[model samples]
Structure formats: structure tokens, C-alpha cells
Target: MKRTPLFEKHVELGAKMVDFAGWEMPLYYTSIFEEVMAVRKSVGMFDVSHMGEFLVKGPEAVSFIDFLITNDFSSLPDGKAIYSVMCNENGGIIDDLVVYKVSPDEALMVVNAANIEKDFNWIKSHSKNFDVEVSNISDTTALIAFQGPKAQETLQELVEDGLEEIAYYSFRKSIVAGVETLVSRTGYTGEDGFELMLEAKNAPKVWDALMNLLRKIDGRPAGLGARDVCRLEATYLLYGQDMDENTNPFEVGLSWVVKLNKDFVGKEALLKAKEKVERKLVALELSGKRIARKGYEVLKNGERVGEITSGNFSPTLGKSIALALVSKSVKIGDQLGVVFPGGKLVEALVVKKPFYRGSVR
Candidate 1:
């Protein structure tokens, strides 16, 4: 099991370790529900350092990246990042990623951990006629996420600048608590927060410092278990579960991120898919406390129209919530049923994205 630099701290804090994408990550400390609530109401941090980072440089860097990702990298300026997806010629998603425009000829790409090797190989195979250099720098980069309403207030005190001034999805290299790092206003949780990237050796110090800061502000280190539930509630797409190679952006509700006006790898496929996509992603809350989990069949009149991609017991709502891919006929406020544990059918209603909103800021 690959442990992040913060592994010891998580163990010391009594976090239950679980394997996530081959990394030994925390499942929870006290309870998944409690940690989820803490993030929804206050703040929660996570060691997401295992995510992949690639530094692409050289004169052809921008062109190489623009040719690869679905989003228009040209839209972003230097020191900014944008959510994107890598797809095949047919538009099947290879991995969802974030592209950072560091400079005119240099850019950084971050991707999910499990897709590291595949993404690297794919990029290398496509590297031709471009003065581009790509390196898998994931091992050298460490990432941490502090999320919730109080996220800025807590981390801002530790850094030199005002965290509130950092615009959303933008990042810059700055020194925080004596360590030079990259701070970006991005998060998986629906709350306002930031993701910090630092060197491998300096990561531990920053992690400990942030943890200590969180404690001072009544924040806690949340686990992937709670993180998954929170992200699902926000209808954030999970790579392997909610979206995958067979899934197109239109079906997964990521069409907003795809700019078809510009030429991209999957442009033709997605443009042609406009006529074929009949199902989309939606949020669901069980009538009772039934937890609809991934792989569960989504039934309509006892017929399978779609399947539950991500689901869990929501701490904020005190009921089970999920993001499921269903036929468009599964409209908001429609009564739906899902198969839960022990092969039982659970009743729920299709609701809009985001179960609840509060002043986490």
C-alpha cells in the first residue's frame, strides 16, 4: 500500500486506513457521518497527494495540451486552471483532468491517481510533430484539500496573503507558512476551499501545519468515504463510477465543460451524440434511510432504465443521497426506486443537484 507523506499523522489521529486507487488513504477518523457533517457545516481536510501531476513544457506544450483535452486550454490565462477531460477519437472519456496554464510554453496537468500510467502512455504515444516534453511529476508533487465555509478563514490565517482574494479555479505559486507552493481555489466539496500543492519533502510540514490550523478552527481531517458522499451530493462526477470510457460527457452532465465550438479529440463524437443521448445524471434521496450504492439497478416500473453510479448515507440530510444516471423521463420530484443492499428495492425521489445549501463560508 502506498502511503502519502501524511500517513503517520492520519494513523496518529486514529483514522481508519483504506485502499483508494492503490493508495493507503483514510476512510474516516471518528465516523464517516460525523466527518461529512463537519465538512458541510464547518471544515474538513484531506490528503489528496496521490493524485497525478504532469508538467508539460517546451514550445509545443500548449498545442499538445490543446489537442488532447476536451476543454479549450486557450481560454485560460497564465496562473489559472480549468477542469477538462481527455478522450479518445470517439469521445470516450479516458480521464478527467485539470489543466494549469503556467506560462506560454509550459503547462501542468493533474489527473486522477488510477489513470496515471494510462494517461502518460497515451500522451507519449500522441506526442509527434510537437516540441513538447511531458513528464510524470506526480511523485514529486503533494496535494492537500481544505474544504468548507470556514476553509478560507482558517487557511488564510496561515498563509501570507488573503485567501479570499484568490479567485475560484485560479492558482498561483506562493509561500505559505515558509514553504513555497501552489495554492488553488478548487475543491470537490461544494463549499469554498483550496487545494495546496507543494514539493514532496516540504509536504509533511505543510500537512502538519494545516492540520494544526484546522484543529484551532474546529476543523478535522475527513476521509475519502465522506468525501465521496459529499461530492456525489453535489453531482460531481466520479471518474470510474459515474463517468468512464463508455460514457460521453452529454450523458454524464459534463456537457457544460465541453466546448464543441473548438476542435478537440472527441468533437465529432460529442457533436454527433447530441442526437443519441437519452439519459443524464441526477440527484436522488431515498424516502427512508435506504443507502443506494454503486452498481445498483435503477428501476422504473420494474424495468431498468439506468443504474446508480454513486450513492451513500448523507450526513447533512440524515438520509441516503445519490447521483444516478437515469432516463430523462426520471424528472425532478419523480418517485423512483433503487435496489439497495440485500437485494431490496428502496424508494426515492429524483431531485435537483445539491441536496442542501448553507453558509459554509
Candidate 2:
């Protein structure tokens, strides 16, 4: 298994490590429920440094990215980031990503760890007529996410620049905890937080300092367990679950992020099949503590409607919540059945994505 720079730190903190996408990541430290509650009421931190980072540069960088991604990066300015998706020629998702425009000729893309090689080649292969240079620097960069309502309060004690000034989905370079870091006002959790991009060598110093600071501030150490629940509540799309090469944005409630006006890899295909969306992703809420794990059947009227893509026992809602792909015939408030531990098809209701609106803070 691959280990991040913070792997030793996780072990020292008694983290329950697990193999996630070929990386040995922390599943939880103490109790998953405790971590969840901490994030809802206070702040929590995680080492997300294993994700891939790829860079595209040169004179044609701007045009190259604008041509490849769904979001129109043609108008994007420097030091800003945008949520985007890379699609095949047919508009099917290659991978959803966040593109950070560092300059007119340089752009940074954060991709899924598992798709590092595939995405690197895909983007490189598209740089034909453009004066672009693509570099896969995933091994050199580190990612850290500090999330929740109290994020500002906790981090301000260290940086003191007032992160409250930054709006949602924005980023700025600032010194954090006395360390120069690129603090992006973004997060997967539906709360006010930031993702810090730091150099791999400097990560341990910053990570340790932040952990100590968080402990002093009475914040909890959040793990992947709580992270998944928080993102699901935000209806944030997980790469393999909410979308993939076989799925399109129109079917995952992410069409708003897909700008069809721009010429992208999958523009022609998506435009041609705009009206052929088959199953759509829907949010589901169960009555009790039962979780609808991924790959579970979404049964409607005693038959399978689709498959559960991602699910968890929502800590905030005190019920099981899930994002499932179901036939368009499924409507909000429709009662559905989810296969449980055994052969039992437990009862649930089709609701909107993000079963809970409140944050861990």
C-alpha cells in the first residue's frame, strides 16, 4: 500500500488505517460517531494529501484547459479555482475535478488518486495544436482540509487574516499558522472551511503544528468516516459513485456545473444525446439506523429501480442516507425498498440529494 507523508502521523495518533484506492489511509481514530459530532459542532481536520495534482502550462494553457473541461476556463482569472468535469467525446464523465488557474499560461488540476495516470494521459493527448506542457506532480504536493463552521475561528488564531472575508468557492494565498500556504476557501463538506495546498516536505511541520493547535482549540480529529458522511450530505459527487465514464452529468443532478456552450471533449456527443438521459441520481432517506451501502439495489414497487451509488448513516439526520441512481420514474416522496444486511428489502423514501442541510459546525 502507498503511504502519504502523514502516514507516520496517522499511525502515531492511533488511526485505524485501511487501504483506500491503493493508499493506506486513516479510516478513523477513535469513534466515527464522535468524529462526526465534533465536525457538526466544532472543527475537524484531515490529511487529503494523497489526491493527484497535475499541471498544464505554456502559451496555450488557457485555451487547452478551456477546450478540455466542461467549465469555461476562458474567462477564469489567476489565483482562482473552479469545479469542473472532464468528459469523453460522447459527454460521459472521465473525471470530475477542480481546476486552479495559477496564471494565464499555467493551470493546476486536482484529480482523483486512482485516475492519475489515465487523466494525465488524456489531458496530455489533447494538447495537440496548443503550445502546452502537462506535468503530473501528484507525488510532490500535499493536501489538507480543515472543515466546519469553527474553521475560521480556529485557523484565525494561527493566521489571523480573517478567512471570513473570502466567499464560497474562492481561494487566496495566505500564511497559515505562521506557515506560508495556499489556503483555498473550498471544501467537499457543506460547511465553511479551506483546503491547504502545501509542498510535500513542509507538510509534516504544518500538519503537526495544526494538529497541536486543533487540540489546544478543543477541535476533533476527523477521519475519512466522517468525511464521507459530510460530503454525501452536501450531495458532492464522488468520482466512482456519482459519475464515471459510463455516466453523464445530466443524470447526476450536476448539469448546472456542465456548461454546454463551450467546446469540450464531449460537447458534440452530449449535445446530440441531451434528451436521452436514462436513470438519474436521487437522494434516499431511511427510517432508522440502517445504512444502504453502495451496490445495493434500489427497489421500487417490489422491483429493482437502480443501484445505490453511495450511502452512509447520516450523523446529523440520525438516519441512513444515500445517493442512488434510479429510473426517472422514481419521484420525490416515493416509498422505496433497500436491501439490508440479509435478503430484506427495507423501506425508504426517495428524497432530494443532501438529506441534511446543517453542517458539522
Candidate 3:
């Protein structure tokens, strides 16, 4: 397994390491539950350096990106970012990513770690027809997510620039803790936070400085376990577990990002698929403390209707919640059943998305 730039830092903090999508990542330091609470009530930092980064440049950068993603980027200004999905020719989702328009001719995209190689190849393969240069910069980049309600206050003291000016989904090239870095006001934890990207070699120093600052506020470094709970609460989709190349965006509740009016790689297919959306993603709140695991069958009216894509006990909500791709017939407030091993079933109620909303500023 590969290790991120913060491997030694995590080890030194007594993190429990585990294999995660080919990377040896920290699962937790103190406890998953405590780490979850830390981010919810105060602040926490996560070493997300394993995620992938790609730099797209040239005069055709915007057009190339616009052709590759479901979101329209023709008018996206520099220093802003957009969340989008790249799909295959059949409209199946290749990956969900964030594109940062660094300049009119240069853009950066961050992708899920597991799909780094695949996404890079896909983008490069499609760039041949356009006047663009694609560089896979994942190996040289380090990312850190400082998250929670107090994230802004905690980071504001370290940077020279006013963090308040950096609105959500915007970024700036700035010096952080004396290290030149790209600070983006974005995160996956459903909290008001910033994701910092810097040179790989300078990560340790920046991480140590941030940790020192967070310590003053009773904050600590969080791990993947806490991150999973937080994102699940936020209803953010995890690529492989929640959706993949076989899944269409609409089926997974990502229709908002798809713009059929504009031309894209899979626009035609997606347009055709709009009228054939057989299933939709739904949130389920299960009774009791019984957690619903992925791949568990979802039954409606005693018949199997779908399966859980992602599920866990939501620490923030204090209940077992799940995101399942079920038949369109499954409406909010409808009671459903989740099948466990040996055919045992648990009762669940369909609910609106985002089991919990955080104080994201």
C-alpha cells in the first residue's frame, strides 16, 4: 500500500493505520466517536493527501473541461470551484470531482484517490482532440482539511490574508504558516472549513503548525473513521461504495449537476436517461441502534426494492442512517425493511437527504 506525505505524522500521533483504497491511512487516533464529536463541537484536521490532483492547462482548458464534466464551466471565473461529475459515453459516472479554475488557461481538479489512475487516463485520452495539457499532479501535492464550526477562527490566526473574504467554493494562493499554499474554502465534512494544498515536502511542517494551533482550542487531528461518519451525515457520496461507472447521476440524486442543455461527453445519453430513471437515491433512518451496512437489501411492502449503498450509525444524529438507491416508489415517510444476514430484517423510514446539517458558516 502507498503512504501519504503525513504518514510519519500520523504514526507519531498514535493513529491506528489501515488500508484504504490502496493507501495506508489513519483510521483514528484517540477514538472514532471522540474524533467525530471533536469536529462537530469544536474543530479537527484531517490528512487527506491521498486524494488525487490534476492540472489542466492551455487556451482550450475551459472548453475541454466543459466537454468532460456534467457541470457547465464556460462562465466559471478564476479562483472559484465547481463540483461536477465526469461520465462515460453511456452516462455512467466515471468520478465525481471538484474543478478549481486557477486561471482562464489553467484549472486544477481533485478526484477520489481510488480513481486517480483511471480518471487521469480518461481525461488525458479525451484531451487529444483539444489544445490542452493534462498533468497528473497527485504525487506532488499534499491536501489537508481543517474542519468544524470553529475551523475559520482556528485558521484565521495563522494566515496573513483575511479568511472571511474567501467565500465558500473559492480559493486563493496564499502563505499558510509561512508555507506557500493553495487554500480552498471547501471540505467534505459538511462543515465550514478549508482544504489546503501545498507541496508534498512542506506538508509535515504545515501540518505540525496547524496541529499546534488547533491544540490551543482543544481540537485534534481526526482520521478516516470520523470522516466517514461526518460525510455520511452530510450525505456526500463515496465513489466506489455509493456510485460507480455502472450508476447514472440521476439515479444517485446528482441530477442537479447535470446540464443537458449544454453538450458534454455523455449529455445525449443522460438526456435519454432522464425519462427512464427507474430508481432514486433515498435516505433512511433506521429505528434503534441497529446499523445498516452496505449491500443490505432494501425491501418495500415485503418485496426487495433496492439495496443500501452507504450506511452507518450517524454520530451527529444519534441514529442509524443510510443512503440507499431504491425504487422511485419509495417516498419520504414510507416504511421499509433492510435485510441482514440469515434473512433477518430491520424496519426503516425514508427521510429527506442530509441526515444532519452542520454549522458550515
Decide which is better by TM-score, 2 or 3: 3
Best by lDDT: 3
Give the residue spans of candidate 2 off by over 4 A: 160-162, 359-361
Candidate 3's residue-wise lDDT over 1-361, tens digit each? 9999999999999999999999999999999899899889889899999999999999999999999999989889989999999999999999999999988899999999999999999999999888999999999999999999999999988888889999999999999999999999999888889999999999999999999988899988999999999999999999988899989999999999998889999888999999999989999999889888889999998999999998888878889999998988889999999998889899999998878889774
Q: Each prediction's TM-score against the native? A: 0.96, 0.96, 0.99
Ranking by lDDT: 3, 1, 2
For residues 1-361, write the lDDT of model 2, one tens digit per residue.
9999999999999999988889999998887888777677777898898789988989989999999998889988887889988999888899999998889988889998888888998988888889999998889889999887788778777664667766666677777756677788888778778888888887888888788777876777778898898888877889987789988888888787778787878888888757787778999888777788878887988888998899888878877889998898899999999887678887888886667655432
Best by TM-score: 3
The candidate 2 region of ten consecutive residues with least summed lDDT is 352-361
Off by over 4 Å in 1: 357-361
Error of 2 at 168 (Å): 1.7
